[PDB]
Amino acid sequence: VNQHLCGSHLVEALYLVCGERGFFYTX
Amino acid sequence: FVNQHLCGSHLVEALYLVCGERGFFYTX
Amino acid sequence: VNQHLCGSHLVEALYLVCGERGFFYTX
Amino acid sequence: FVNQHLCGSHLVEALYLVCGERGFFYTX
Amino acid sequence: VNQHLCGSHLVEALYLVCGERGFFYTX
Amino acid sequence: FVNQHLCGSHLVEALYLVCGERGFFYTX
Amino acid sequence: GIVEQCCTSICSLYQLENYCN
Amino acid sequence: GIVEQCCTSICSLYQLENYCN
Amino acid sequence: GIVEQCCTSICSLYQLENYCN
Amino acid sequence: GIVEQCCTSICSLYQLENYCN
Amino acid sequence: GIVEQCCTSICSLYQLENYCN
Amino acid sequence: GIVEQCCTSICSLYQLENYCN
Ligand SMILES: [Cl-]
Ligand SMILES: [Cl-]
Ligand SMILES: [Zn+2]
Ligand SMILES: [Zn+2]
């Protein structure tokens, strides 16, 4: 669960950092 | 967009839950 | 606190899964 | 709605904090 | 990391509670 | 606003990540 | 409805509390 | 309860559906 | 694109699943 | 500090108000 | 104001950084 | 992987950029 919660925040963060580039999320 | 920007934030949260272990690419 | 943080994510999740049905959150 | 959809997401987060131990029903 | 995740939720919360007043976040 | 309200929520999340240890003031 | 009331105008914490249990 | 069921272990989407109206 | 499809109309979970790996 | 005060134990809404402007 | 600048146009991370301490 | 790299310790913005397209 702790990992699940972290991923949610990772994804928001990648979203802001990467911008027009987009990103991949692979756990 | 701004509206488009806010929406994307919610899209990725939704993809995160839906895709689960599979993961995803976000390309806008 | 760990439980408080989890509930926030639960609620977002129920929101997406349930859609027009809506949901109840009872801790 | 889309705008309505995005708003609902924020409504439930707010109800979560406001209602606390009481909890809530979300019916749209 | 646990602290990082908590701060994110703190900030959303301060945002709702404080309203027009605004708030300061200092870790 | 409502649109302005939803946007602010995302602004503070973004400032949180960007500012990091520095922190920030939110004044609207 | 809550969608009706609070997505057209901003609802305060006190207004939102009305939808608690 | 959902906290019991879904905050100690991750609940699938199917599981979460149990808490819809 | 996903922005095109799902920010103009609400996309269901099933629609969103199309963008998974 | 707020991290000290509110990330080890849950802070009430009244407590969080201490950090408003 | 930040609401003025960044809710009318999208503000980059670099623009947002201006509002840090 | 990003979970390995960024959920055990906090990843800087520069680090997260590694996972952009
Ligand atoms: Cl969390
Ligand atoms: Cl929004
Ligand atoms: Zn969280
Ligand atoms: Zn939003």
- In helices, the fraction of residues of chain G equals 40-55%
The number of distinct helices of chain A, counting runs of at least 4 residues, comes to: 1
Could you tell me the radius of gyration of chain A in angstroms? Answer: 10 Å
Strand content of chain G: under 5%
Main beta sheet strand tally, sense and closure of chain G: none
Per DSSP, what share of the residues of chain A sits in E-state strands of 2 or more residues? 5-15%
SSE class of chain A: mainly alpha
How much is the radius of gyration of chain G in Å? 8 Å
What best-fitting shape of chain G do the alpha-carbon axes yield?
A: flat
Bound molecules: chloride ion, zinc ion
Most residues in contact, chain pair and counts: A-B, 14 and 14 residues
Number of strands of chain G: 0
Helix content of chain A: 55-70%
Largest sheet of chain A: none
| Quaternary state of the chains | heterododecamer
Number of distinct helices of chain G: 2
The gross shape of chain A turns out to be: elongated
Instruction: Give the SSE order of chain G as H and E letters.
Output: HH
The helix/strand order of chain A is HE
Distance between the termini of chain A: 14 Å
| CA distance, first residue to last residue of chain G | 15 Å
Organism (chains B, D, F): Homo sapiens
Protein name (chains B, D, F): Insulin B chain
PDB class: hormone
Keywords: Insulin, hormone
Structure description:
The complex is a heterododecamer, with six copies of chain A and six copies of chain G (21 residues). Chain A is mainly alpha-helical and 27 residues long. Chain A is 63% helix and 11% strand. The radius of gyration of chain A is 10 Å and the shape is elongated. Chain G has two helices and no strands. Chain G starts with a helix and ends with a helix. The longest helix of chain G has 5 residues, at 2-6. At the A-B interface, α1 and β1 of A face α1 and β1 of B. β1 of chain E pairs antiparallel with β1 (24-26) of chain F, so a sheet runs across the interface. The structure holds chloride ion (2 copies) and zinc ion (ZN) (2 copies). The site of one zinc ion (ZN) has 2 residues of chain B, from α1. One zinc ion (ZN) sits between chains A (5, 8-9) and C (5, 8-9).
